[PDB]
Every structure is written in C-alpha cells, then in structure tokens.
Amino acid sequence: SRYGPEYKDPQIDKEYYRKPLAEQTEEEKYERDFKKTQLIKAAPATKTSSVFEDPVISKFTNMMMKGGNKVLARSLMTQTLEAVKRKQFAKYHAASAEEQATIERNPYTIFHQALKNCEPVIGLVPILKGGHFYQVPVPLADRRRRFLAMKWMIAECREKKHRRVLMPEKLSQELLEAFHNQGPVIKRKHDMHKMAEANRALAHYRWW
Amino acid sequence: TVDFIKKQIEEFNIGKRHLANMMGEDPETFTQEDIDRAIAYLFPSGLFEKRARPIMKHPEEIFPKQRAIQWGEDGRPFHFLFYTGKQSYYSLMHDTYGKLLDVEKHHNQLRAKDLLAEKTKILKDPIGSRWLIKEELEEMLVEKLSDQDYAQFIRLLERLSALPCGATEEDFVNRFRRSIPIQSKKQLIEPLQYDEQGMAFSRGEGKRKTAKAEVVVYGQGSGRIDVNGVDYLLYFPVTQDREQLMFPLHFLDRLGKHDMTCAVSGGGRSAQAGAVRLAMARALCSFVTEDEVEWMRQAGLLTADPRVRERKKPGQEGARRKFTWKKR
Amino acid sequence: KNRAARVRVSKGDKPVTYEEAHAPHYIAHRKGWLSLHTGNLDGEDHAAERTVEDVFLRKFMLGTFPGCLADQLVLKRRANQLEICALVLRQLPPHKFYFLVGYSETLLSHFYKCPVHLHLQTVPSKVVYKYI
Amino acid sequence: HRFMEPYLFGSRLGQDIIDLEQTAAHLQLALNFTAHVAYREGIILFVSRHRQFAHLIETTARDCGEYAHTRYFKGGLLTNAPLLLGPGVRLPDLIIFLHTLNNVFEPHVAVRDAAKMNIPTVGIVDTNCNPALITYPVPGNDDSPPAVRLFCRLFQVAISRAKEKRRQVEALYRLQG
Amino acid sequence: SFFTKLTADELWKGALAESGAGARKGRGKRTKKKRRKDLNRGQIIGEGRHGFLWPGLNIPLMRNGAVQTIAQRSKEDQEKVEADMVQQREEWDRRRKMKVKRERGWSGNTWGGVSLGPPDPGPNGETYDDFDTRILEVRNVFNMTAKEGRKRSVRVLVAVGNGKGAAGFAIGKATERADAFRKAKNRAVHYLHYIERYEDHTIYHDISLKFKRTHIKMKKQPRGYGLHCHRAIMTICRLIGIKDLYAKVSGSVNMLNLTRGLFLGLSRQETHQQLADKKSLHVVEFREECGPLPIVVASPQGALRKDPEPEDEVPDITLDWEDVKAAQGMKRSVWSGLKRAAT
RNA sequence: UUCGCCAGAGUACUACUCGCAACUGCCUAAAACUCAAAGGACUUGGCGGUGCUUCACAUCCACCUAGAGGAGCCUGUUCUAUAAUCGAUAAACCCCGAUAGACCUUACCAACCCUUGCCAAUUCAGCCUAUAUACCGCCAUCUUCAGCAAACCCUAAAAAGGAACAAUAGUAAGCACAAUCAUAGCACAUAAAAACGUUAGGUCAAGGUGUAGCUUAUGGGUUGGAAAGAAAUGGGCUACA
Numbered sequence A: 001s002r003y004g005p006e007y008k009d010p011q012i013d014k015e016y017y018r019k020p021l022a023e024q025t026e027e028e029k030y031e032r033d034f035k036k037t038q039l040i041k042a043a044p045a046t047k048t049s050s051v052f053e054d055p056v057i058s059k060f061t062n063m064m065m066k067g068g069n070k071v072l073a074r075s076l077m078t079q080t081l082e083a084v085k086r087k088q089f090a091k092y093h094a095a096s097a098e099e100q101a102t103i104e105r106n107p108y109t110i111f112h113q114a115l116k117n118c119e120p121v122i123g124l125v126p127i128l129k130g131g132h133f134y135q136v137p138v139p140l141a142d143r144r145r146r147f148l149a150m151k152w153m154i155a156e157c158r159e160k161k162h163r164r165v166l167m168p169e170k171l172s173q174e175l176l177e178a179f180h181n182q183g184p185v186i187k188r189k190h191d192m193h194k195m196a197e198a199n200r201a202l203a204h205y206r207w208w
Numbered sequence B: 001t002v003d004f005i006k007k008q009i010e011e012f013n014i015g016k017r018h019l020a021n022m023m024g025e026d027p028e029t030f031t032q033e034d035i036d037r038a039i040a041y042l043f044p045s046g047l048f049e050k051r052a053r054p055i056m057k058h059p060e061e062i063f064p065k066q067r068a069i070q071w072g073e074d075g076r077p078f079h080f081l082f083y084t085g086k087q088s089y090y091s092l093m094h095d096t097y098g099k100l101l102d103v104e105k106h107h108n109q110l111r112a113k114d115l116l117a118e119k120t121k122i123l124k125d126p127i128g129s130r131w132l133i134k135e136e137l138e139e140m141l142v143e144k145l146s147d148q149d150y151a152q153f154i155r156l157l158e159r160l161s162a163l164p165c166g167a168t169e170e171d172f173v174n175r176f177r178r179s180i181p182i183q184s185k186k187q188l189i190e191p192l193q194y195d196e197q198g199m200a201f202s203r204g205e206g207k208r209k210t211a212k213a214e215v216v217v218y219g220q221g222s223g224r225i226d227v228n229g230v231d232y233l234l235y236f237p238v239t240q241d242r243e244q245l246m247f248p249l250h251f252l253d254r255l256g257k258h259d260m261t262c263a264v265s266g267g268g269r270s271a272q273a274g275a276v277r278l279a280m281a282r283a284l285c286s287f288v289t290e291d292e293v294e295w296m297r298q299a300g301l302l303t304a305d306p307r308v309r310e311r312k313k314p315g316q317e318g319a320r321r322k323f324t325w326k327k328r
Numbered sequence C: 001k002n003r004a005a006r007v008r009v010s011k012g013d014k015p016v017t018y019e020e021a022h023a024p025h026y027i028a029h030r031k032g033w034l035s036l037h038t039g040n041l042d043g044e045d046h047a048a049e050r051t052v053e054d055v056f057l058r059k060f061m062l063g064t065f066p067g068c069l070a071d072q073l074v075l076k077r078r079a080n081q082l083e084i085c086a087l088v089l090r091q092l093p094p095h096k097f098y099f100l101v102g103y104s105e106t107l108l109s110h111f112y113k114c115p116v117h118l119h120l121q122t123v124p125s126k127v128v129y130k131y132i
Numbered sequence D: 001h002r003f004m005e006p007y008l009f010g011s012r013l014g015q016d017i018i019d020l021e022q023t024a025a026h027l028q029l030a031l032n033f034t035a036h037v038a039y040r041e042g043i044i045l046f047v048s049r050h051r052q053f054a055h056l057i058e059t060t061a062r063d064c065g066e067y068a069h070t071r072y073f074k075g076g077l078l079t080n081a082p083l084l085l086g087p088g089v090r091l092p093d094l095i096i097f098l099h100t101l102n103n104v105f106e107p108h109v110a111v112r113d114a115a116k117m118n119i120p121t122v123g124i125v126d127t128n129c130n131p132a133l134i135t136y137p138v139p140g141n142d143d144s145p146p147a148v149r150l151f152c153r154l155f156q157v158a159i160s161r162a163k164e165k166r167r168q169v170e171a172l173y174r175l176q177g
Numbered sequence E: 001s002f003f004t005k006l007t008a009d010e011l012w013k014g015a016l017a018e019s020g021a022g023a024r025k026g027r028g029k030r031t032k033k034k035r036r037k038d039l040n041r042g043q044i045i046g047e048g049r050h051g052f053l054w055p056g057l058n059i060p061l062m063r064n065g066a067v068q069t070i071a072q073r074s075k076e077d078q079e080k081v082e083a084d085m086v087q088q089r090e091e092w093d094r095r096r097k098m099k100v101k102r103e104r105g106w107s108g109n110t111w112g113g114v115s116l117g118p119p120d121p122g123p124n125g126e127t128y129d130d131f132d133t134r135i136l137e138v139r140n141v142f143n144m145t146a147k148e149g150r151k152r153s154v155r156v157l158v159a160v161g162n163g164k165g166a167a168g169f170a171i172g173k174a175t176e177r178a179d180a181f182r183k184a185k186n187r188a189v190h191y192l193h194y195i196e197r198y199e200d201h202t203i204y205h206d207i208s209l210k211f212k213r214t215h216i217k218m219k220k221q222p223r224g225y226g227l228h229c230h231r232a233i234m235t236i237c238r239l240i241g242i243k244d245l246y247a248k249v250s251g252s253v254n255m256l257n258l259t260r261g262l263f264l265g266l267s268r269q270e271t272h273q274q275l276a277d278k279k280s281l282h283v284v285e286f287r288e289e290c291g292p293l294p295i296v297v298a299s300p301q302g303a304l305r306k307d308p309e310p311e312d313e314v315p316d317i318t319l320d321w322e323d324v325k326a327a328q329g330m331k332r333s334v335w336s337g338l339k340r341a342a343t
Numbered sequence F: 001u002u003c004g005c006c007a008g009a010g011u012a013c014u015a016c017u018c019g020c021a022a023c024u025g026c027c028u029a030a031a032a033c034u035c036a037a038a039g040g041a042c043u044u045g046g047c048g049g050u051g052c053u054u055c056a057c058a059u060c061c062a063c064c065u066a067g068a069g070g071a072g073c074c075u076g077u078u079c080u081a082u083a084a085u086c087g088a089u090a091a092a093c094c095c096c097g098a099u100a101g102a103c104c105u106u107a108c109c110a111a112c113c114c115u116u117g118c119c120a121a122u123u124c125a126g127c128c129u130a131u132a133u134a135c136c137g138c139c140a141u142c143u144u145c146a147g148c149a150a151a152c153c154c155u156a157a158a159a160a161g162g163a164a165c166a167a168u169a170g171u172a173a174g175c176a177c178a179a180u181c182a183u184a185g186c187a188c189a190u191a192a193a194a195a196c197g198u199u200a201g202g203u204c205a206a207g208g209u210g211u212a213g214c215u216u217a218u219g220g221g222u223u224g225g226a227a228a229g230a231a232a233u234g235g236g237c238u239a240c241a
C-alpha cells in the first residue's frame, strides 16, 4: 500500500530485454515505458530471474505455507519433488523397455499436468431467489480454476492422511494419482461437474 | 491599507539596517539569505511548522495583494467594467477577445491578398510550457477567481493560439505560460574508482526493512561473495536468500566476472538479503552500459522497498487486527 | 469529541488569544510550551518539584494580579535563577505595579530559596488573533 | 407580448411589424434624456445579456467613457451594492438596456432592480419584451446586427455631444468670472 | 488544599450550568433566572481582613514629605470599612432586584404596539430621527431540522412611520428576538409608502378593499371621530399621520394580510385633484355645518369641459348590507355604541 | 335570472315517523351524551419490505486466511450465599474505572475511642451523602458524513427557499473539510484532526461544584474480616498433534 498508483509492476523476464530489436510493436511500448517517468515497484523476494522456478510452484508453496514458515513450505515442496522423482525412477527401472519411452520422470511437467487434470471446468454460485439458495452453474475464470485445483489437493492431503505419513509422502502419491486421473481430487471434480449437470436447468437464474 | 504598507516598508528598512549593524555584516550587501539566517540564530524557535517560525520579509510578501481604489472623489469608477463584479478578469477576457478578432480580421485580409507568412507557434513541447493554474491566475488578478471562468479563459487562450499568431499576440500569450521542471528519472551513475592499484572497484549502498548493506565490487576477480568475513553459502543457509543474491548477477550475466564483499547489519535473514541485493544492484551500475541499468531499474533492482512494519495502534492488536467486537 | 484545552466556537463574536485558538495537538507544531526547564529531558531528574513550583506560581500570580493578566505566564528556568514573564493590562498605576513586583521578587525568592526575576509587559488590551 | 400591441403597426404574414413613427418619437425622448444625464455628470451603464454583440457593446461603452455590463448579472448587484461592489459605491444614474431579455428568454434582473432602486432606465424593446417597468421604451429590433449598431452609434454620438457641450459650457463659465 | 482551587470563570460556568445538556432541546425554562455576579467589582487590591495600610496600595506613598511605614487600622476603623463594604453589597442588590415595567402597546404581556425606537441610520449617513416604529406581531416560528429537531425562530412584523404621511412595514425573522427586531427595523425603511391624507386628518374617500381573505371597510370621518378602528390599524394610522378614521375588518384577521391590504388601499386612493383632472369638472365640497355653501377643494386644471356629467336617476352603486343596516338603524348590537378610551 | 343544499366534530348512510311489489331493503331523517376542537391546503425534516442511476474495497454478496461458540486455565460480568463497597452494564459494558486489592490502598462491615476535631482565625472544620435529569472539567456514537454559521439581498409573503456556466438571485467574514504538520528526503500509507448538534449517553467516586441533607455524626482514628460456588456468559492463553 506504500506504493502509489503511479508505480508499475516490474518485468522479470530477461529475454524480454535481451532482444528488443527482434520486433517493432514492443519497441513502441518499451520506449515510452520510461519516458512517462513511470516508477517501478521493488522486486518481491519470492520472484526472481532463476530458470528453475515456476509461478505455479511458487503459488502452491505459498498456499501450503502455514503462518510465516516459508522455509518449511519450501522444504516441503522440495521434499515432495524429490519423492516424486525417486518414485518415478523406481518405476522406470522396474519397468521394461517399452514403458520407459512412455513414463515421465520430470516432476514439473507431471505437477502441471496433474493440476490441469484436477482443474474444474465450471463451478457453482449460490444465488438467493424466492428466499432459497440455488447452486447455479457458472463458468469459472482461469485463476479461480487453478486456485480451486490447488486448494482441493491441499485440503485432501492435509486431512485425509495418517499421522505417521508425512506431507511430502502423501503429496507424492496424490500427484501421481491426479496425473493418472485416479485421485480423490479427480473424484471431487467429477462430483462438482455432476452437480452442475444436475443444476443446469437453473442456469437461467444467472444475470451475467 | 495603502499607508499602512508604506509605513511597514520604512519600518522594515530600518529593521534591516539595525539587523545588519548588530550582526556585523555590510548593510549594502545584506540580503534575504542573510536576513533569514540571522533571524534563525537570534530567535531559534524550534517548531515543526515553518510558517510559525519568526520571519522578517518585505511587506509585499507578508501582506497579500491589496485591491486598489476603484472610484475617485466624485464616486465615478475608473475602469469601465467596474459594475461587472470582476473588472480585472472581465477586462482581460475583453482584451483577449479583441485581440482574437484582430487576428481573425488580419488573417482574412491576408487570405484575400493570398499571402501566408505566419507559422505554427503553438507547439511548445520541447520548451515544456504549461498553462496557468487557478492560484497563479489569482496571483496576477487581485480579485478572486472561479473554476468555470478560468476554464473559459483557458479555452479562449487555446482558441487564440490555434489561429495564425501575430507579432504582438505571441508575447501576450507567452506571459500566461509556465515552465515545467525536468521529469527525467535517470539516476546518477558512480564513476569507476581505482584505489590501491585495484582496477574496476565500485561501491553501493542499500536499505530494506531496517537493514543497511554496503557492498564493494571488484570487476577483475572471480565470482564470489564475502559477507561479514564469511562466505555467502554459510551466511545464508536458505536457498531463497542466495537466490536474492543471484537475482542481480543473473540479470546481467556477470555471475563469474565480479568479486563482491558485503557488510550488512540489522533486520532478519530476508531483510539482509533484500538490502544486499539492492546494494549490489546499485553498485553494479558502474560496470554496465546505460542500456541495461535502465532494464534493471525497470525490473525493480534499483528501487527501494518502502514496505516497513506499521506502528501498532492503541485499542488494536497488530495495527490492523481489532478486538473482538461484540454486537450485544 | 475532544474537549481538552479547546475553546468552543461561539456565533462569531468572542475574542480569543493565539494560545487559546490552537488545539493541544498543535503544541511544538504551531505553538510552544509555556514553561521551559531541564526536568523533562531524558536522563534528568527532579521534574515533579518543577511542575509543582510552576503550578504554585501560576495560582499565586493569578491572585497577585487579578483581572489585569492578559495571558498565561512564561516560566524560564536557567541556572538556578527563575525568570517569570507576564503580559498585564495597563489597568493599575505604575506606582502599584512597582509595589507588586518588588513584593513578589522577594516573596518568591524567600519561599523557593532561589533568585527570581519578574518581567511585565503592559498591553492596552488582550491581543486578538482569530475572530473577535 | 401582450403589451406590444399598441407599439405594432401590423403583421406581415406572421411576422409582426413595428411602426417607426412611434419608434422615432420614443427614440428622440430617450436620446434627449440620455444626453441630459451625461451632461449632468451621471453614471450610465449599458446592460445587455446577448452573446452576439457583447464585444461591440463593451467597445461602445469604452469609447463613451460610460460603463458596461454584458456578462452574467449577479443577484444582489444593484440591491446589495454595499456588499457586492464596495463599502460606499455610487449607483449608476441611468441604465440603458440593449437587450431586455436574457439568454433564457426571461426579463432581465436589472430591469426590475433599477425600478426597485429608483434608477431611470432607457431600453430597446422587441416584440417579445415587457416595457412596463422601463422608463423610456424604444420599440425596435434588437436581433439584427445593423439595428444594434445603429442604436450603439446613436448613443455613442449622444454621449460624445453631451460631454463636449458640458466642457464648452464649463469653458464659458470660466470666462464668465 | 490550595492546589484544589479553580478560577472564578470556571466556578461560575459550572454553577450556572449555562451550557447544560438539559437546556438545549427545551426541557428547561422551569427556573428562568440566570444571574452572574462579579466578585471583583468593589474589592480594593490593598484592603484586607487584618486592615494593613500598605504604602503602595492603600495609602499614598509619600505623606508630609516623608515615607510611610507599615501601619494597621484600629478595630473601630476596620468595623467602619467593613460596614461600608457590606452597605455596598445591598446597594448593588437594590439595583439588581429592581425591574422596570415593559411597554404595554396593546396588553401587559404582548409586543403588539410597543415602541422600538427610531431605526438605525443608513450606510451613507442619513439618520431617521423623526421616524417612529411599532411592533405589530411577534410569533415564535418552529422548523424541523434533521439533527436538532425543532428550530425556534422569532418572526416580527414591524411598521415604521413619521406622522407626515410616509410609512412602511417589514418582516424580520431571526433566531434571537433582538436580532429580529433589528432586522425588521433596518428593512422597514426600504419599503415606504406615501399616504394621501385629506386635510392631513382623514382619507379622501371611503375604501372597501378585498385582500386575499381579509375585507377592510374604511370610511371618511370628520374632525370629531378619532381613530375608531382595529387596535393595529389605529397604530398604523397614528404612525402615518391620520387622526380621524373608522375601519372595520371582516373575514380573516391575519396581521400580515391586514397590514398589506391596509397599505394597498391607502396607496390606491384617488385624490380630489386627480378626480378633477380625470373628469375635467370642478370638485365642490358641500359641508353639512356650512349649509349650502359650495366650497371648492380641487380645480380641474387644463381644459374645463362644459358638458355636464350624465345625471343617473337611479345610481347602480354596489351597496353593503351592513352599511344599509347602520343607516336604517337596525344595528342593535351592544358592542357598537360602547364608550371607549381616547386615541 | 333562477332552483336544490350548507349553521362545529363524533354520535349518524343512526333510532323513532311517513311512503315504497322493496320485510337482513330504499328515501327523508334527529336527540341524549363527550370534546374544544373537528377539518382543507402548504413548508421543512424523518421514513419508505416505491422506482430509476452511481456505489460498497475488509464490505453486502460471488470468494481468501486465521479464530470464537467444544476442553482446561486466567480474568470480567449475571446469579444464588454472607455483616461486608460503588459505578459501567445495546451498537458506544464485559483484562471496563484498575498502566492493577494481605495491612494501607478501600469509599464495605463488626468491635472499640475522639468530638471547634489538618489550616493563622472563623455559631467553624469535615461528608466517597442524594441529584451526571443542574455542571464545569474529560470522553463515547453518527464520524474520514460534510456540513454549521454571523452580516446582507431577493420572493406578487416569506412555514420557507435561493441553483442552471452558451448561467435563470445570489454575495458571504468565520468554524469545519482540504492543505500544512509528525513517522528527520520526496510520493503513498499511517498517525493526528474531525465543526454545529443527537443519544437528559458515561463520570458528584480524578478534582471543584448549584440545590437538598449530616455536626457527641451520613464526621474523624485502631484492630479483625470482606468468604464460597448450585449455575450461566463475554474476552484471552494452552493445546487437541
């Protein structure tokens, strides 16, 4: 809030500035970006120019963080990635030659694919009409869909596990199940879709 | 109050002579930058408001512009627009309209004669000219002003400027123009320094969340950081803190081309990491061209972080958390 | 609503002084303190004694000069000698003013075991700052 | 207007026609009154609320040495003069209306304020004006540029002649003693 | 104990409770007696209980060319001085307890008809010393406000007149009664009517006017019928200069409407000279006690028409039934011929 | 020029008569009794589960995070119980007066003593006695809402209102708002400020107080006790991993 309305969000992509001469449309904007005396906010500590970080991973770590233990959240994320990598390597080495060309060991791509698989398509909005609340089906925004996809998995893995089982160990199994379209997160997404299909006849209640 | 200001002028002159005599400076060379300096010493009033401090200026600055007499001894008003309420603003509007009509008729005659000698003298972008503000116009015209009349005057001035400018019209329209200050936000680049037969030596300072960091960078050594006498790996066990160090160097691709020594105090781990990142970014400006320092400042490396913890308020918990408000 | 050291605004005819026209939150911003001493510093002591002496001086001078006092007194404490500056309406003759100042300069000195100076500035009337 | 019937010669296919005999009869008296007021050192204010000839009226008043009002007429100008103009101000001794109606097609404020303050008013009235409160009504046209210029020049020359004759009378008075 | 004392200003402000919260909305007015006494009125700063005479305060500094030492009065002298001081207290209380009776224009507890004094002079310096004014009506007007609620404002009708035929009326409304009086006085002089008075004692002709809802019937009277009119019309005519008149007000008796109608009727009079000018005939007065003597009051200046007016055998005059009853003696009311006080 | 009606309101499109294919019907149509009013129109606020536009930025929802209401403890209240204070006790009370209780604090009670009894004196001291519905001093709420308001002027009268920017009666000191100030550079943010009034809001117990009451006592001193929880509830800490 200390930054005034004139402050603009910084650009972290280095390739955006490394080759400004490859296109002319961006030139007209980046030449007047600084001419208008546009002040730029400080770069956040979470976001950097490293190539091994992803905004999706950062958002998931922030959502998993409890209170202010960002170090603990980062350690949990790293342990989950290590666990999924090792579990994929074990299956890669236990499988035959034909399955090795199909099984994937990269944790980032399987994490993104699992998140997309567990992303809902449409959601429900409670609308009050006639003194009663109806769950009207409604298209969801991209950010809302991604947040719901992350939140469902986080809530399931925080509560539906045994005390002896650790968070990275549970998350490693859940990510694989979601990637293979077998997890309770996928079941919850299907339940939401079925509820929306049941309440589709109430979609006329929406006014936007 | 015409005689009162005149008497105050003589009293101010006498007081200026006395102040110069008692301070010991030459009264002939005594000016306002000495008057205020001597006042601040003789009457050291410590107050937060500057206008509450003792001040001795010429009466024309202290007293506001007093309205001149409008009618003679016989009661006849001097100006012909006295009964219009605003005899200065309306006279100015009448003169502007008369000059606009003169310009229009002269341009019509010139077009009839088929002559074009005027040019476009309305584009003053390189000069940096602007129109007068309401307060500036109220300074020129002793009488009070409004918003609608000021807008009408500005819209008539732009109409006049949109026509082929004359010889005497440009000087009249220029007296309502004001120069703007430089809006350049380009920072000052420290020159490369050579101390104790050491080449490519620079220094930078950074502050973030009660953390002060001073970083010295040598452009001839290998890539390594020495913080508080220990290596950065030992001083920052957290990978995010080391990513803060990597953020400026990776943007300039100078990971293994500069050796940096930092001294940071105050704050926590993240505050120290931010302070050293800011100091390193500010120090690296000397070793890079002017094209990439602007890229760093647009990426957010050369700007401070004003996010400081707010003071706790009475009756609250954390300056935002209110107590449990019971409705009944 | 805040009411401390705040004179309520009338219909627009009451005379107020410069000190009265400023709210207490303007202290050290637009107006200064009526008394100056070293007791209210950080590493100093003996502040309660100075405060009680100051309030006794206020109450004593209010009765000593009844009806002719213009505004609050100024109590300067500077190296064991105490200066008291007052603004007084020129209602009493100078013959009585000198009698009163000579009485006070000795009474306060013998009561507080310290030298005192008393300075009076005569004014034709109370100075008006805001609307009168 | 209902009160313009005695001042109309007739109607020429919808458009009313103002008779010029009574126009000249009223104009002679109006010019004589204005010249006498100027001769007796009276303040004359040319009032007109019409956004076509405001500059012409201002220039005519400047040439005459009399005062003009062609802008937004303030509320308590003539009535609350001691608070609108100054502590002690001398009100105009004659008000000359060049346009009785304002931009809202309504009677002007000054045409009533002059009657309230006992200020004589000479006014040019069109077929849609109300001459009841005007001391010297002149039935004519106030919408044609030549019509406006004719009245402006007539008042200009009347003021100039009155002032010049006053100066000549004073010059003779100087030699009389 | 000394530090526990306060100042007299705060003591009186707390004792009187002038700014109390119960007297704002209107819960007060029960004990309407507010009096503040200054205790420093007659207290000499040198005098005291022990009776010391200080050379700088009580006694002169130099006497007989020498300096005076600290002296003390005797017990008898102190008793005399304190007796004089006590006597001053009751002397001031005597003045404080005395209240001069207020004016009774129409009744002992009304402001109708009371004198308010000459109006204030104008900005240019004109002074109205010959003008006398009277209050016709005082009414407490209330308005509903969002915050306070009822907003009491006094509205006063005030009529000015010089006795020479020039008079006017105005309405002043203000929060305070004195401010309303001042506003009405300063605004009445701006609206002055001139009343044509026949022989400066009566009106030229009888007038029957019908205002908004008030009917006023005024009849010309001789020198012996002095102001037998309503209690406010009598005051207005006394201010104007009319000494003889009979007026009856029927219908609504609203004060403002009555005043406006009376002024309109008096302003719309027709002078004898005006009638002579408009008829081109001589106006001849036939006095009853002067026999058949044809007294001429107005001369038709200009062209005197020689054509006599058409003599109507039966005049079609809009008569009034009350006047017909009065002429025929059918007015048997007991309130018509009552004996009343002089003007 | 005529005809039919109107004499406060309620009683009352009523009762009692006459007349009528009407028999719970229609027309005409009172009185006793009660009141000083009953009524029509209008102005300003307030309200509206009226409608139309613009809004909500921790605010209503669409939505995010952390908690209360479940357990123990601490603490404050409401209740029972004692000889054993008091006030607050809807938003604006409930770790509130109290940034603070073994004696003192403490104004409560029981036992005992003193009555010109703190001060130079006073047919005087002293009262935490009642009245916050008599106050000052200090605050709470609307409230980060902007309006309040002296002096004038105008209205075919005036309860009241006062505006059209290509301007149609509005000028307006001043208090508010704003700006400035402080968080040692700007900007932002925070802090501070927030008038006139509403809640007869809280405070005679910070202190003094107008009125009404005590004076061998409702005043002044010493000792000892001021529990306890059948129960309910507010706010916090600890956790339920």
Ligand SMILES: [Mg+2]
Residues within 6 Å of the ligand: B317, B318, B321
């Ligand atoms: Mg917190």
Ligand SMILES: [Mg+2]
Residues within 6 Å of the ligand: D126, D127, D141, D142, D143
């Ligand atoms: Mg016309």
Ligand SMILES: [Mg+2]
Residues within 6 Å of the ligand: E107, E108, E109
């Ligand atoms: Mg009486």
Ligand SMILES: [Mg+2]
Residues within 6 Å of the ligand: E253
């Ligand atoms: Mg009546």
Ligand SMILES: [Mg+2]
Residues within 6 Å of the ligand: none
């Ligand atoms: Mg009846």
Ligand SMILES: [Mg+2]
Residues within 6 Å of the ligand: F013
């Ligand atoms: Mg019926």
Ligand SMILES: [Mg+2]
Residues within 6 Å of the ligand: none
């Ligand atoms: Mg019936």
Ligand SMILES: [Mg+2]
Residues within 6 Å of the ligand: F058
């Ligand atoms: Mg909320």
Ligand SMILES: [Mg+2]
Residues within 6 Å of the ligand: none
């Ligand atoms: Mg918790």
Ligand SMILES: [Mg+2]
Residues within 6 Å of the ligand: F068
């Ligand atoms: Mg709970």
Ligand SMILES: [Mg+2]
Residues within 6 Å of the ligand: none
């Ligand atoms: Mg609980």
Ligand SMILES: [Mg+2]
Residues within 6 Å of the ligand: none
């Ligand atoms: Mg209690």
Ligand SMILES: [Mg+2]
Residues within 6 Å of the ligand: F087
């Ligand atoms: Mg209670």
Ligand SMILES: [Mg+2]
Residues within 6 Å of the ligand: F090, F092
């Ligand atoms: Mg409450």
Ligand SMILES: [Mg+2]
Residues within 6 Å of the ligand: none
């Ligand atoms: Mg005890």
Ligand SMILES: [Mg+2]
Residues within 6 Å of the ligand: F106
């Ligand atoms: Mg105890």
